[PDB]
Amino acid sequence: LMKILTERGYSFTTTAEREIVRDIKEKLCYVALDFEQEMATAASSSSLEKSYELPDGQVITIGNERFRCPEALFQPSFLGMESCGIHETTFNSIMKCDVDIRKDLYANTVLSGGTTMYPGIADRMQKEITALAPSTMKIKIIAPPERKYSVWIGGSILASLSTFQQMWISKQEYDESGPSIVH
Amino acid sequence: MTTLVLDNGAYNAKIGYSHENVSVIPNCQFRSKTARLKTFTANQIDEIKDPSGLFYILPFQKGYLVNWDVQRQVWDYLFGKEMYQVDFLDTNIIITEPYFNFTSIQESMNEILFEEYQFQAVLRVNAGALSAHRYFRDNPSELCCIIVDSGYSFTHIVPYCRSKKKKEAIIRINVGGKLLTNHLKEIISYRQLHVMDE
Ligand SMILES: Nc1ncnc2c1ncn2[C@@H]1O[C@H](COP(=O)(O)OP(=O)(O)OP(=O)(O)O)[C@@H](O)[C@H]1O
């Protein structure tokens, strides 16, 4: 993204500067047409350039990185490092998984993490997984409204689970097995 | 030839041959709450790097014997190495016996000594009788002596005269070193907290 902004004209070169580029993700995180979104939007750039707030007041109509590298997740070849597009990567995962369990894998595909806050990830995963998967199996995507910290929330719940007491490792067994415990 | 003198009780099991092995070797087994419940023997306590909370398995909790298993295990672990040089029929053993001990238990102990360890000879001398003989040898001009043996688990007032003990003026008292230690434990527990059992 810093290289993209350099092509634009800002030309940042260090983290102390591109902290604001990191922040740009707060608004420039949408993608609709994974194959031609950036071109179709550069052709009709209006009401899509959120104009991120630069410190110097430069509100230039950011309208290409709005759709460039939210899609880099689905198209690794777009960056330069090659890999299965995030969607087909998850698909290959559930494919290598068992056959019977693959139905529940299709039906319970969760999305979590700070990077998943991109509003378009849900719909794009829906479309790509429906294109890559059979017709009988549907895609019941579930993106929690607060997926930003879903991992932390679930961990805190698992920790403060009522009858989970017996499963905590303690000094008692540490003093006789140490790290040789289940690990 | 050499001989093996053995005195035994609740706290201490003092075995020694004609020249060395002079120490306070205990008689009970120790189990460490931390060392995977390993059962230690009389002298193996020195191998325990943390004797806190040791559970005591006692062949004697007071003057009389209980649970032969522990006593026989202690004797085997002692004999198995430098302490006695397990050789059996080469030498003999002299074991002490309480003032008024279980007749059946003591004769069965003699039976076991003759059968399993097969010492070429052993006798029924008394713990107080041995001290009486020691004192008589120390003072040959004496003809009568009273022994006040206040052991760690014993308190015996035993007379001796004309090389014979009389079973009428022979007193034993249950106030022993073990009782004193337990009372100190209880006092410290009660006066620092409401429970403490080390
Ligand atoms: N609302 C958001 N929209 C888009 N991107 C975001 C958002 N919030 C955070 N990010 C990006 O996601 C990253 C943080 O990831 P997240 O906190 O979800 O997991 P993480 O703990 O940071 O990563 P890891 O679990 O590997 O430590 C940040 O580097 C940030 O650029």
From Swiss-Prot, chain A:
PTM: ISGylated. MICAL1 and MICAL2 produce the (R)-S-oxide form. The (R)-S-oxide form is reverted by MSRB1 and MSRB2, which promote actin repolymerization.
Effect of M125R: In THC8; uncertain significance
Subcellular location field: Cytoplasm, Cytoskeleton; Nucleus
Domain of life of the source: Eukaryota
Cross-link ((Microbial infection) Isoglutamyl lysine isopeptide (Glu-Lys) (interchain with K-50)): E82
Quaternary structure and interacting proteins, as annotated: Polymerization of globular actin (G-actin) leads to a structural filament (F-actin) in the form of a two-stranded helix. Each actin can bind to 4 others. Identified in a IGF2BP1-dependent mRNP granule complex containing untranslated mRNAs. Component of the BAF complex, which includes at least actin (ACTB), ARID1A, ARID1B/BAF250, SMARCA2, SMARCA4/BRG1, ACTL6A/BAF53, ACTL6B/BAF53B, SMARCE1/BAF57 SMARCC1/BAF155, SMARCC2/BAF170, SMARCB1/SNF5/INI1, and one or more of SMARCD1/BAF60A, SMARCD2/BAF60B, or SMARCD3/BAF60C. In muscle cells, the BAF complex also contains DPF3.
Disease: Dystonia-deafness syndrome 1: An autosomal dominant form of dystonia with juvenile onset, associated with congenital or childhood-onset sensorineural deafness. Dystonia is defined by the presence of sustained involuntary muscle contraction, often leading to abnormal postures. Some DDS1 patients have dysmorphic features, skeletal anomalies, and/or mild developmental delay with impaired intellectual development. Baraitser-Winter syndrome 1: A rare developmental disorder characterized by the combination of congenital ptosis, high-arched eyebrows, hypertelorism, ocular colobomata, and a brain malformation consisting of anterior-predominant lissencephaly. Other typical features include postnatal short stature and microcephaly, intellectual disability, seizures, and hearing loss.
Family: Belongs to the actin family.
Note: In vertebrates 3 main groups of actin isoforms, alpha, beta and gamma have been identified. The alpha actins are found in muscle tissues and are a major constituent of the contractile apparatus. The beta and gamma actins coexist in most cell types as components of the cytoskeleton and as mediators of internal cell motility.
Function: Actin is a highly conserved protein that polymerizes to produce filaments that form cross-linked networks in the cytoplasm of cells. Actin exists in both monomeric (G-actin) and polymeric (F-actin) forms, both forms playing key functions, such as cell motility and contraction. In addition to their role in the cytoplasmic cytoskeleton, G- and F-actin also localize in the nucleus, and regulate gene transcription and motility and repair of damaged DNA.
UniProt name for this protein: Actin, cytoplasmic 1
Organism name: Homo sapiens
Lineage: Eukaryota, Metazoa, Chordata, Craniata, Vertebrata
Whole-protein residues included: 189 to 371 of 375
Swiss-Prot record, chain B:
Cellular component aspect of the GO annotation: cytoplasm; cytoskeleton; nucleolus; nucleosome; nucleus; Swr1 complex
Cellular localisation: Cytoplasm, Cytoskeleton; Nucleus; Nucleus, Nucleolus
Residues with the N-acetylthreonine modification: T2
One term of GO molecular function: nucleosome binding
Domain of life: Eukaryota
GO biological process: chromatin remodeling; negative regulation of transcription by RNA polymerase I; nucleolus organization; positive regulation of transcription by RNA polymerase I; regulation of DNA-templated transcription
Keyword annotations from UniProtKB, A to Z: Acetylation, Activator, Cytoplasm, Cytoskeleton, Nucleus, Repressor, Transcription, Transcription regulation
Protein function: Required for formation and/or maintenance of proper nucleolar structure and function. Plays a dual role in the regulation of ribosomal DNA (rDNA) transcription. In the presence of high glucose, maintains active rDNA transcription through H2A.Z deposition and under glucose starvation, is required for the repression of rDNA transcription, and this function may be independent of H2A.Z.
Subunit text: Component of the chromatin-remodeling SRCAP complex composed of at least SRCAP, DMAP1, RUVBL1, RUVBL2, ACTL6A, YEATS4, ACTR6 and ZNHIT1. Interacts with CBX1, CBX3 and CBX5.
Family (UniProt): Belongs to the actin family. ARP6 subfamily.
Protein name: Actin-related protein 6
Taxonomic lineage of the native organism: Eukaryota, Metazoa, Chordata, Craniata, Vertebrata
